[PDB]
Amino acid sequence: VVSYRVPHNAAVQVYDYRAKRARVVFGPELVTLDPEEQFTVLSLSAGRPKR
Amino acid sequence: VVSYRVPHNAAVQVYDYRAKRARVVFGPELVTLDPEEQFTVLSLSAGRPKR
Numbered sequence: 001v002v003s004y005r006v007p008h009n010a011a012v013q014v015y016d017y018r019a020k021r022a023r024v025v026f027g028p029e030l031v032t033l034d035p036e037e038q039f040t041v042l043s044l045s046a047g048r049p050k051r
Numbered sequence: 052v053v054s055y056r057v058p059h060n061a062a063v064q065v066y067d068y069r070a071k072r073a074r075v076v077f078g079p080e081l082v083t084l085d086p087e088e089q090f091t092v093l094s095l096s097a098g099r100p101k102r
Contacts, residue, residue: 005068005089030068030087 002033013040053084064091
């Protein structure tokens with residue numbers, strides 16, 4: 001299983017492509033991806049000034 | 052077991068990803084992490100001026 005341990009004040013958005021349904025869980029939950037569930041990888045800005 | 056000895060005027064926040072529950076304990080307690088409990092690692096500013 002692929003399971004991500006979500007931080008407390010954080011949200012992870014997934015979709016079950018096998019089931020045609022959308023769900024996003026905020027808060028400190030342990031997501032459990034179905035065999036065709038995929039994550040919302042977020043490219044975020046960082047660096048000293050910004051990137 | 053992984054157990055952290057919390058200082059007296061300090062607070063440590065954990066979540067049991069296996070149990071879908073949030074708890075934070077302040078004060079001088081000895082936390083005991085469940086097999087899917089994880090800590091709130093806090094990156095804090097330090098240095099002479101600041102970092």
